[PDB]
């Protein structure tokens, strides 16, 4: 049962992983008066959101970044402990927005938030961790997922990568290649390693018995990413995501080449 529910589900005006378009429409079929607004999952930043509000009949979209310490914020805005709090705050204070929030655009009756890719990642990595940590399976597994998600999350989005099997504390491009070539040389075999530059690492995987290297950089915010641009709290999250989508890679990550 991949794909997990977002922490902002209970909110009536939360649409989940939709597009600006669908969101711009929902607001179009809701009046279009100053203040109307809704909340959706951010299509780029895992754990992120986007505040879509209308003012002067014009549409406004403010991305909400999920900071490493768990708070949420519009770029240059104040931090909040959650999206509800963020919406409650702006409802009573524009603090820079075109106007305060007045009247939400509750998702039409019968409709509910839709699962983006990030929702698959969360279930997938929580699912993997448990099944691999306690060998749970079947219904037993499905429960520990709901019960451990909160912990697994705190764990997977926090654990030092120095402890992950696929992380090799010290290896040069050449050192790396030799290790990947010396094995089952199967598509997807991969490992991670540090780069000279500060906050830069290198993903090295094999495909077609040939080795490829990808640069992973850490931005001011403290999140990692490869050229394609999807950003993450941790390498673990990033690795587990690259196992789902080749986002720029020649091939998706599969088996880890042992520490």
From Swiss-Prot:
Tissue spec:
Expressed in T- and natural killer cells. Also present in early thymocytes and pro/pre B-cells.
The places in or outside the cell where this protein is found are: Cytoplasm; Cell membrane
**In what way is this protein post-translationally modified?**
Phosphorylated on tyrosine residues upon T-cell antigen receptor (TCR) stimulation. Ubiquitinated in response to T cell activation. Deubiquitinated by OTUD7B.
Some GO term, biological process aspect, for this entry: which one?
A: T cell migration
What's the stated role of this polypeptide?
A: Tyrosine kinase that plays an essential role in regulation of the adaptive immune response. Regulates motility, adhesion and cytokine expression of mature T-cells, as well as thymocyte development. Also contributes to the development and activation of primary B-lymphocytes. When antigen presenting cells (APC) activate T-cell receptor (TCR), a serie of phosphorylations lead to the recruitment of ZAP70 to the doubly phosphorylated TCR component CD247/CD3Z through ITAM motif at the plasma membrane.
Gene from which the chain derives: ZAP70
Task: Tell me which species this is from.
Answer: Homo sapiens
Entry GO terms, CC: cell-cell junction; cytoplasm; cytosol; immunological synapse; plasma membrane; T cell receptor complex
What range of the full-length protein does this chain span?
1 to 256 of 619
- Superkingdom of this protein's organism: Eukaryota
Protein name as annotated: Tyrosine-protein kinase ZAP-70
Taking every annotated instance into account, which residue ranges of this chain make up the domain SH2? 13-105, 166-257
